[PDB]
């Protein structure tokens, strides 16, 4: 589990969104496994605006924050899970590291701020949904 709180927005994995998130939906994209909902209170997170390929992510199944190198956001084939059939997931970044389904929502961060959240994994690779291209998260 996990979310990003920036301005009056809440960014979560689309497969873990709650009924309140869907009722207060701002934007969602199934191919990215992301959903953004509106909030009443202001968040404190800063979204990175950069092309970094190094950072640190939180892995709940190890209670550890791991420094990693990661790929640039791309369209990658992802095997079936309990939440989606096998399909191409867009805006996905991979790193060599440990992850389990319940690690979804763990934040990847660089020196500039939040880069993305854990979404996929397997074979010793962890996949993160990028949010750096969602420029509108910084305004209004
Ligand atoms: C080993 C592993 N690490 N991680 C973080 C996983 C995540 C899943 C998973 O169910 N994700 C749901 C969202 C989703 C995107 O694409 C398909 N399904 C499955 C296996 C792993
Ligand atoms: Zn950065």
CSV table of C-alpha atoms and ligand atoms in Angstrom, one decimal:
chain,number,residue,atom,x,y,z
A,1,UNK,CA,0.0,0.0,0.0
A,2,UNK,CA,0.9,3.7,-0.3
A,3,UNK,CA,0.1,7.1,-1.8
A,4,UNK,CA,1.5,10.4,-2.9
A,5,UNK,CA,-0.1,13.6,-1.5
A,6,UNK,CA,0.7,16.7,-3.5
A,7,UNK,CA,-1.4,19.9,-3.4
A,8,UNK,CA,-5.1,18.8,-3.2
A,9,UNK,CA,-4.4,15.5,-5.0
A,10,UNK,CA,-3.9,11.9,-3.8
A,11,UNK,CA,-2.0,9.6,-6.2
A,12,UNK,CA,-2.5,5.8,-5.7
A,13,UNK,CA,-2.2,2.5,-7.7
A,14,UNK,CA,-5.5,2.3,-9.6
A,15,UNK,CA,-5.9,-1.3,-8.4
A,16,UNK,CA,-5.8,-0.2,-4.7
A,17,UNK,CA,-8.1,2.9,-5.1
A,18,UNK,CA,-11.0,3.0,-2.6
A,19,UNK,CA,-14.7,3.9,-3.1
A,20,UNK,CA,-13.9,7.5,-2.0
A,21,UNK,CA,-11.1,7.7,-4.5
A,22,UNK,CA,-13.5,6.7,-7.4
A,23,UNK,CA,-16.2,9.1,-6.1
A,24,UNK,CA,-13.7,11.9,-6.1
A,25,UNK,CA,-11.9,10.9,-9.2
A,26,UNK,CA,-9.7,13.5,-11.1
A,27,UNK,CA,-7.9,11.2,-13.6
A,28,UNK,CA,-7.1,7.5,-14.0
A,29,UNK,CA,-5.4,5.3,-16.6
A,30,UNK,CA,-5.7,1.5,-16.5
A,31,UNK,CA,-2.7,1.0,-18.8
A,32,UNK,CA,-0.5,3.0,-16.2
A,33,UNK,CA,-2.1,1.4,-13.1
A,34,UNK,CA,-2.6,5.0,-11.7
A,35,UNK,CA,-5.5,7.0,-10.2
A,36,UNK,CA,-5.6,10.5,-8.9
A,37,UNK,CA,-8.4,11.7,-6.5
A,38,UNK,CA,-9.1,15.0,-4.9
A,39,UNK,CA,-8.4,15.8,-1.2
A,40,UNK,CA,-9.7,18.4,1.3
A,41,UNK,CA,-6.3,18.9,3.0
A,42,UNK,CA,-3.1,20.0,1.4
A,43,UNK,CA,-0.3,17.4,0.9
A,44,UNK,CA,3.4,17.9,1.5
A,45,UNK,CA,5.0,15.8,-1.2
A,46,UNK,CA,7.0,17.3,-4.2
A,47,UNK,CA,6.9,15.6,-7.6
A,48,UNK,CA,10.3,15.4,-9.3
A,49,UNK,CA,10.6,17.2,-12.7
A,50,UNK,CA,13.7,15.5,-14.1
A,51,UNK,CA,15.0,12.5,-16.1
A,52,UNK,CA,17.0,10.9,-13.1
A,53,UNK,CA,17.7,7.2,-13.4
A,54,UNK,CA,19.0,6.8,-9.8
A,55,UNK,CA,17.0,7.0,-6.6
A,56,UNK,CA,15.8,5.1,-3.5
A,57,UNK,CA,12.5,3.1,-3.1
A,58,UNK,CA,10.7,1.8,0.0
A,59,UNK,CA,10.1,-2.0,0.0
A,60,UNK,CA,7.5,-2.9,2.7
A,61,UNK,CA,8.2,-6.7,2.5
A,62,UNK,CA,11.8,-6.0,3.7
A,63,UNK,CA,11.1,-2.8,5.9
A,64,UNK,CA,14.0,-1.4,3.8
A,65,UNK,CA,14.8,1.6,1.5
A,66,UNK,CA,17.0,0.4,-1.4
A,67,UNK,CA,19.1,2.6,-3.6
A,68,UNK,CA,18.6,1.7,-7.3
A,69,UNK,CA,19.3,2.5,-10.9
A,70,UNK,CA,16.1,2.4,-13.0
A,71,UNK,CA,15.1,2.6,-16.6
A,72,UNK,CA,13.3,5.5,-18.4
A,73,UNK,CA,9.5,5.3,-18.5
A,74,UNK,CA,8.4,2.9,-21.3
A,75,UNK,CA,5.8,0.5,-22.6
A,76,UNK,CA,6.5,-3.0,-21.3
A,77,UNK,CA,4.7,-6.3,-21.4
A,78,UNK,CA,3.6,-7.3,-17.8
A,79,UNK,CA,2.4,-10.8,-17.0
A,80,UNK,CA,-1.1,-11.4,-15.4
A,81,UNK,CA,-1.6,-10.6,-11.8
A,82,UNK,CA,-4.6,-10.8,-9.4
A,83,UNK,CA,-5.7,-7.3,-10.7
A,84,UNK,CA,-5.0,-7.2,-14.4
A,85,UNK,CA,-4.7,-9.8,-17.2
A,86,UNK,CA,-1.3,-9.8,-19.1
A,87,UNK,CA,-1.0,-6.6,-21.1
A,88,UNK,CA,1.4,-3.8,-22.0
A,89,UNK,CA,1.8,-1.3,-19.1
A,90,UNK,CA,2.8,2.3,-20.1
A,91,UNK,CA,5.1,4.8,-18.4
A,92,UNK,CA,6.7,1.9,-16.5
A,93,UNK,CA,10.3,1.9,-15.1
A,94,UNK,CA,12.2,-1.2,-14.0
A,95,UNK,CA,15.0,-1.7,-11.4
A,96,UNK,CA,16.8,-4.7,-10.1
A,97,UNK,CA,15.4,-5.3,-6.7
A,98,UNK,CA,13.0,-7.2,-4.5
A,99,UNK,CA,9.2,-6.7,-4.5
A,100,UNK,CA,6.0,-8.5,-3.7
A,101,UNK,CA,2.3,-7.6,-4.6
A,102,UNK,CA,1.8,-5.8,-1.3
A,103,UNK,CA,4.8,-3.5,-1.9
A,104,UNK,CA,2.6,-1.6,-4.5
A,105,UNK,CA,2.4,2.0,-3.4
A,106,UNK,CA,6.0,2.2,-2.1
A,107,UNK,CA,7.5,5.5,-3.3
A,108,UNK,CA,10.6,5.8,-5.6
A,109,UNK,CA,12.3,9.1,-5.0
A,110,UNK,CA,15.3,11.0,-6.4
A,111,UNK,CA,17.1,14.2,-5.3
A,112,UNK,CA,14.2,16.2,-6.9
A,113,UNK,CA,11.3,14.6,-5.2
A,114,UNK,CA,8.8,11.7,-5.9
A,115,UNK,CA,9.4,9.8,-9.1
A,116,UNK,CA,6.8,7.1,-9.0
A,117,UNK,CA,5.2,4.2,-7.1
A,118,UNK,CA,5.7,0.4,-7.1
A,119,UNK,CA,3.3,-1.3,-9.4
A,120,UNK,CA,4.8,-4.5,-10.9
A,121,UNK,CA,7.5,-7.1,-10.3
A,122,UNK,CA,9.0,-10.5,-10.7
A,123,UNK,CA,12.1,-12.3,-11.7
A,124,UNK,CA,14.2,-10.0,-9.4
A,125,UNK,CA,12.9,-6.8,-11.1
A,126,UNK,CA,10.6,-4.2,-9.5
A,127,UNK,CA,8.5,-2.0,-11.7
A,128,UNK,CA,7.4,1.6,-10.9
A,129,UNK,CA,4.6,3.7,-12.4
A,130,UNK,CA,6.1,7.1,-13.3
A,131,UNK,CA,4.3,10.3,-12.3
A,132,UNK,CA,6.9,12.9,-13.4
A,133,UNK,CA,5.1,13.6,-16.6
A,134,UNK,CA,1.8,14.6,-14.8
A,135,UNK,CA,2.7,18.3,-14.7
A,136,UNK,CA,-0.8,19.3,-13.6
A,137,UNK,CA,-0.2,17.7,-10.2
A,138,UNK,CA,1.8,21.0,-9.4
A,139,UNK,CA,-0.9,23.5,-10.2
A,140,UNK,CA,-4.5,24.6,-9.3
B,1,LIG,C1,6.8,-9.8,-7.5
B,1,LIG,C2,5.9,-8.6,-7.6
B,1,LIG,N1,6.3,-7.4,-7.2
B,1,LIG,N2,5.3,-6.5,-7.3
B,1,LIG,C3,5.4,-5.2,-6.9
B,1,LIG,C4,4.2,-7.1,-7.9
B,1,LIG,C5,2.9,-6.6,-8.1
B,1,LIG,C6,2.0,-7.5,-8.6
B,1,LIG,C7,0.6,-7.1,-8.8
B,1,LIG,O1,-0.4,-7.8,-8.5
B,1,LIG,N3,0.4,-5.8,-9.2
B,1,LIG,C8,-0.9,-5.3,-9.5
B,1,LIG,C9,-0.9,-4.2,-10.5
B,1,LIG,C10,-0.5,-4.7,-11.9
B,1,LIG,C11,0.3,-4.1,-12.8
B,1,LIG,O2,0.4,-5.0,-13.9
B,1,LIG,C12,-0.2,-6.1,-13.5
B,1,LIG,N4,-0.8,-6.0,-12.3
B,1,LIG,C13,2.3,-8.9,-8.8
B,1,LIG,C14,3.6,-9.4,-8.6
B,1,LIG,C15,4.5,-8.5,-8.0
B,2,LIG,ZN1,15.4,13.7,-10.2
